[model samples]
Target: GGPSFPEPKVVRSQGGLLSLKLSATPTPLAIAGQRATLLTYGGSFPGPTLRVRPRDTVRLTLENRLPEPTNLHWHGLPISPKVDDPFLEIPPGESWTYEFTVPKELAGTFWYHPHLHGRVAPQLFAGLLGALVVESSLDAIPELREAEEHLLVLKDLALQGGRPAPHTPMDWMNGKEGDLVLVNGALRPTLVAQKATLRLRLLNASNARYYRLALQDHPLYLIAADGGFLEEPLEVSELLLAPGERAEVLVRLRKEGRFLLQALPYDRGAMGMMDMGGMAHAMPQGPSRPETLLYLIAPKNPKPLPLPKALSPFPTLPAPVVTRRLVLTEDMMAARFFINGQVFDHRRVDLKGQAQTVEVWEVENQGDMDHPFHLHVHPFQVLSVGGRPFPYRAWKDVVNLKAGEVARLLVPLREKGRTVFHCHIVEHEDRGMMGVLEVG
Candidate 1:
């Protein structure tokens, strides 16, 4: 009864939006009776919510107040590399202005976080993440638009002595997770809904935790994914969301009862054991217990809102001109991660392609554990996973590759530029599980 959902401030277009600012600074906060000084955007724990629409020219001035090199990457925006470049770094106390336009067809739940090399894990775990939602015409539907919509940013932190716990060797090896899971900077936050339908846009902002999300006894209708809305609503029994991944689901609470938004147990790999390359461990870095991300209470509500039968249409891609293979591997004891048996070296071009050509990527996970693969610059069409055909066609940037699984992706090089692709797990990326690609 003591915990309440946190209310993060919203920053939208005032008179004319074409302009906004994000100040990344250290903020003192108190959570669950523990004091913490965390790096936050716009001086808020859960950070500020940025709302924009398609074709809107976005001009953001990012001022780095923290005493570290930090830059922001507009995750899953499918914009040009000239704007959302990960190689660009903003040093401490420096300010950089970024100007980009939300493509006319791009609309979904996205994120902005520090993409600084080698410092990603620590900086993000310290709280450098927030939501960037690009609204679309689909949001204007009568039934759907009238429903209550919430952008829930889910994050977990390991706290010690009232501060984010330091990383250990094991943590660096297996990726860091936290025992304390928070939804929008609050503990056990309860969301009250007067409408019959709730549009939940869930973003997994944790470093390494995988959220196997499900509602108590209620079926969640999956509408949109990492890139944008699907062709039609697929009734989802459970959704497995990895780090850097987002999904939009709708739930109807017609009955007068409480519904629990819960995260069930999901095993990425062995719990207490280790394998591959004499990798022996006495214990794991963090324990993932079954926990409720947030609670939803629905009092006797209004008439039920019906879900849309269809959504945005899928974009057709040409036949693949080439197929390339990328392998994900690990050097466990050395604390290094690799793609195609090589660690990240920015000067090296790991792959090459032609602009306006569609290429196929056969990504194999030979690593010891599950790792999510995220591609920058453009979204890939997931053809299949682990030799099984994907149930539906959708554009996605992150695919959670389980151990020993191979995922096939069809990537269209519509934009000409150089960019990087890496594991979505922040620790794994910092450890060098990344590769650079150039499309001309």
Candidate 2:
């Protein structure tokens, strides 16, 4: 309520190409009512929004101005690993360039951030994220193309002395959820709506924190998932967004009233009393606190916008040629995380598969905690969850596995190379809850 909610600057592709340079530098900014300096891309909080269309090419240069090495990971894009490579690091005072063509039939909300191992959590907590949208042709539809749209980049920051706080045992176990929650770089920002039906594109750019989102007295028409549009709009009053997930929704402001956008409390799991490196510690356990994400004020009179009758059709999955199961668990005493009983080894390919082949992967969470699984090289569709068919279908790069939850995915491997799959809890990933996969 301190300042009007401001939209991030938009960077659109021109003549089929988006050319820009993202310089990572420390910039002075106010956060959570304190004067602080944040690691930002291009000197802006939440960074600029890069807008591209299918078949468009993006050429980006990353300038590392910080005191350490860093790199970018284009989370949730179906592009080749060579282009979205997170393995390559740009050292301090160095720069790197990335050029890639957007994949065909791939359109949705995505994001970019530092992906260096062992440092992702603290660096991201220091503020290093932005929205990347691949526009859909369906935007031509009057209902969508003409509707008022907004990009909501959600982030959380735990601060100390006007800077990010270092991790402790609870932070490492639960993945830190900042005391201050923000949207588009502002706390509880106010958005004055001019249209009845609004298109909201939301990206959860947190290191951990799952947002169980809902708006008071209004139905959230879910139109798109991670990769792109859903076949139809689903009227859901609540949608849970884990780390690194995105959703596009349509909110119909039927009457003039303020809308309260909030994240309700959720109990993912607890750390409990555990031995960490031979020392005992009791982790906090409780229902997570609810927080106001945004406040929306609808003008007295607004032009009505209708929801689209249909959206982009679901991607047809290929026949499964292989079946695999990956287990996720944690060694409480050792205070370590693992995939298939092994920690991350960037030099080793933990799994192998054939290119252009379809594989059915059952991601089973065997522990008493939740983990958001993210695969780098390809996107998959949820075939079933907990042995039941998934209600809606869409391409997804990340899926949350609650304690003892098992999710089966149909992955269509298109490219040949090595990539990674990891827990989206960056702390877990950095601490060994990640693995490599090779495609021939």
TM-score of each: 0.94, 0.95
Cα-based RMSD of the predictions, in order?
3.0, 3.0
User: Candidate 2 lDDT, tens digit per residue, 1-440?
Assistant: 43356778999999999999999999889776788888999898898999999899899999999989999998888878887786888899999998989987888799999899878887887889999999988888999987778999888887787777778876777688888899998889889887677899999999888899999888899999988788999999799999999999988887788889999998778565544534343453556789999899886776668778988778687699999999999875465889999998889988899998999999999977789999997999998889988778888899999988999999988778888999998888888898888888
Q: For each predicted model, how many residue pairs clash, with residues at least 3 apart or on different chains? A: 0, 0
What lDDT score goes with residue 66 in model 2? 95
lDDT of 1 by residue, 98-158 (tens): 8987888887899889999899999999888999888889899886798788888989988
Residue pairs with clashing backbones, model 1: none
Specify the highest-lDDT model's number: 2
Which pairs, if any, clash in model 2?
Answer: none
Query: RMSD (Cα, Å) of candidate 2?
Result: 3.0
